[PDB]
């Protein structure tokens, strides 16, 4: 038989998307450039419009909903005590530093300034729409076709403070806060429980509680360098937005298509055709651009189920690990959780 | 040779429509600061739209942007409680929209006084807003929505809660297990019984 | 010409051409095609 | 309500024109001839299709959301009604 | 056997017309003109 005669304390990051950035598409502006005939003629193909408004707003309640169901699993707002001694622990690069104008951790900092978000869904004054910023930001040119993006509704403050008032939970509490009141607790006391729930006596921890502190802390310190090694490490959040902008920017690309019609502009097939023969164009470029609709639709609703999945399973690996001691194998990271 | 084409006084800064030499649109114009070609006299961007144009009478360059808009959002509480009603700009800024109009960062937000207290969030409204209806004489009032109770655990080196007592509590889960099952007739649906109908139909293959 | 171009037609291959030859009114010329009604396609001759 | 929802709205897609000069394909029956009456027909076989189509998808999309979600109802019945889960708010609130 | 299905499906979708005088590119191809045949070979892509 073979009995390990020591241990390493490691941690191992584990990224899952949440949300994603919502879609607001108006079909009247977006397939018709604010013309009367166009218009008129668009209603003649019932109600595909209202649909997609019913499938955009349906997903942008989603998103907040499932948003809220993650981060918001906590009733009350804990904060940590003056004192940020644990006994050895040192969690200042996961707690929220007061001195930064926003409320997040060094590590909450580094993920932010990884991520390069396309659009924040924030007020355009009409300032940032135009002069050199036209030349180089997608965003405005999406949004003047129809392409809305709507902001969520817990801002990044609100998911910052929510994560802030999970770790003083986890820290004071260990994982009776989850379930009932709050009740403090020594956190070696919490680390003796975990080690007591993976089957190893408390003695082990408190005879190495000192070790185990520095392996922590060497951890916490080795995750910085790990994330800011590669921008591989958030590859998963990378990619979603990555794909969000890429769908926003072929749907306002396919405008320029012509969908076997004389040209794509539709003020130029207006003034060099009469109506009886300009119709029949018209026709083709609405029915063009509204089969793109839905396609783009249909894409941005399996790319939300995937999204409702993946924060199914970070509410359930939220609830596990962080408000409780999940026995199952692999599921909170490689290892005795 | 088309004949005279009879031009007329450029005006900029201001929502009007705007043709130069056969490309028409409609936005403002404004004084920009880009380096145009000689040669080069419409400016397109990424996304294959129209952003800038040259002037035929003076080579100066100037921007298109289309004039402001943005969805209308109405909020609104149940009819058969009040009918009064909120307004939001969303996207648009309250110097745009045209006694108690609010400046979101979501948009603009008319019809609701904001004040400084927080509750829970009734009608979601967007960058952390919520509005609800409540007699403050009942309005719609707009409000930072609270994120819970403030609450600060007593930790301590040697301090620990236990509880003496324990209160037994049952929890409903409402969770969808099937469906309507749906079963369309795709002839009798896309044909009304016809007979050269369902033979024009059979030419789409077995959709 | 229905189905087929009337200028490719030397470059292509038949089972059987029949060539039905009538004489009919100029107001009913419309009449002598697929689908059209009247007293010519009705009683006299009808195409598919 | 969104099943209702759904076949309403799909049974209301026949109101729609797609182009043609009318929705009842009677009407184009009695007052057009056959090769004159064949291109609308076309175009309403394509709109009523289409309509199927996005409806079929819809209703693909909410049976995959439904078996997730009797997945999920299972879990929780071999997991808290057969069993006793330890998984913590995986059976409510609290200790299970 | 979905799978294969879904490809049998995708495969045999080629035999559909869509409105237009053959399911054969090549036949529309050469028994139309460009002008004539650009209507049907729009309809033949729209319903690939």
């Not at chain 1, 405005?140 to 994560?163: H, R, W």
């Amino acid at each position: 038989i073979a009995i390990p005669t020591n241990f390493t304390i490691s941690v191992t990051t584990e990224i899952l998307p949440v949300s994603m950035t919502k879609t607001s598409v108006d079909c009247t502006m977006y397939i018709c450039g604010d013309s009367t005939e166009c218009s008129n003629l668009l209603l003649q193909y019932g109600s595909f419009c209202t649909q997609l408004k019913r499938a955009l707003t349906g997903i942008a309640v989603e998103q907040d909903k499932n948003t809220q169901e993650v981060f918001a699993q906590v009733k009350q707002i804990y904060k940590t005590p003056p004192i940020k001694y644990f006994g050895g622990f040192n969690f200042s690069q996961i707690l929220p530093d007061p001195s930064k104008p926003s409320k997040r951790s060094p590590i909450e900092d580094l993920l932010f300034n990884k991520v390069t978000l396309a659009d924040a869904g924030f007020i355009k004054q009409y300032g940032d729409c135009l002069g050199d910023i036209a030349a180089r930001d997608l965003i405005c040119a999406q949004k003047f076709n129809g392409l809305t993006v709507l902001p969520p509704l817990l801002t990044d403050e609100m998911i910052a403070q929510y994560t802030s008032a999970l770790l003083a939970g986890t820290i004071t509490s260990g994982w009776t806060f989850g379930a009932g009141p709050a009740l403090q607790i020594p956190f070696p006391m919490q680390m003796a429980y975990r080690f007591n729930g993976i089957g190893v006596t408390q003695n082990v921890l408190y005879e190495n509680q000192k070790l185990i502190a520095n392996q922590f802390n060497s951890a916490i310190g080795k995750i910085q360098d790990s994330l800011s090694s590669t921008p591989s490490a958030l590859g998963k959040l990378q990619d979603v937005v990555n794909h969000n902008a890429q769908a926003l920017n072929t749907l306002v690309k396919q405008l320029s298509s012509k969908f076997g019609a004389i040209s794509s502009v539709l003020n130029d097939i207006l003034s060099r055709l009469d109506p009886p023969e300009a119709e029949v164009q018209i026709d083709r470029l609405i029915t063009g651009r509204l089969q793109s609709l839905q396609t783009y639709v249909t894409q941005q609703l399996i790319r939300a189920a995937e999204i409702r999945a993946s924060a199914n399973l970070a509410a359930t690996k939220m609830s596990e690990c962080v408000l409780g001691q999940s026995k199952r194998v692999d599921f909170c990271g490689k290892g005795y959780h | 040779v088309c004949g005279p084409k009879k031009s007329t006084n450029l005006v900029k800064n201001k929502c009007v429509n705007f043709n130069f030499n056969g490309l028409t649109g409609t936005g403002v114009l404004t004084e920009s600061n880009k380096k145009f070609l000689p040669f080069q006299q419409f400016g397109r961007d990424i996304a294959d739209t129209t952003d800038a144009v040259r002037d035929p009478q003076t080579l100066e360059i100037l921007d298109i942007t289309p004039c402001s808009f943005g969805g209308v959002s109405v909020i609104t509480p149940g009819t058969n409680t009040s009918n009064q009603v909120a307004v939001l700009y969303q996207g648009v800024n309250c110097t745009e929209v045209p006694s108690n109009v609010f400046q979101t960062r979501a948009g603009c937000l008319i019809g609701a006084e904001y004040v400084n207290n927080s509750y829970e969030c009734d009608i979601p409204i967007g960058a952390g807003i919520c509005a609800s209806y409540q007699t403050q004489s009942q309005s719609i009032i707009a409000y930072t929505m609270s994120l819970g109770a403030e609450n600060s655990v007593a930790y301590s080196n040697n301090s620990i809660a236990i509880p003496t007592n324990f209160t037994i509590s049952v929890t409903t889960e409402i969770l969808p297990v099937s469906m309507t099952k749906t079963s369309v007739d795709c002839t009798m649906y896309i044909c009304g019984d016809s007979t050269e109908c369902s033979n024009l139909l059979l030419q789409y293959g077995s959709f | 010409c229905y189905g087929v171009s009337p200028t490719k037609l030397n470059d292509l291959c038949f089972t059987n051409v029949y060539a039905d030859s009538f004489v009919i009114r100029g107001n009913e010329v419309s009449q002598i095609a697929p689908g059209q009604t009247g007293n010519i396609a009705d009683y006299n001759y009808k195409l598919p």
